[PDB]
Amino acid sequence: ATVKFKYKGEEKEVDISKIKKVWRVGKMISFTYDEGGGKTGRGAVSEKDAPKELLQMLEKQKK
């Protein structure tokens, strides 16, 4: 599955397999993900949006 979100004026669509860490900030689901060049990207979506795969990671990670 993929997560769609806008970050710094750019549209992003990241495969959920790449999501590194995920945490909750109120209604915001915030996360980091693996990118090319050994780098780590950041992203956030509304919980309303939030694919269940991503939300499950929260409950199953929270670390």
Add this chain to the structure above:
DNA sequence: GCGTCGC
């Protein structure tokens, strides 16, 4: 402010 990269 809440939770957590790239100077």
Add this chain to the structure above:
DNA sequence: GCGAACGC
């Protein structure tokens, strides 16, 4: 150490 980023 901190500005900026993200939905609210």
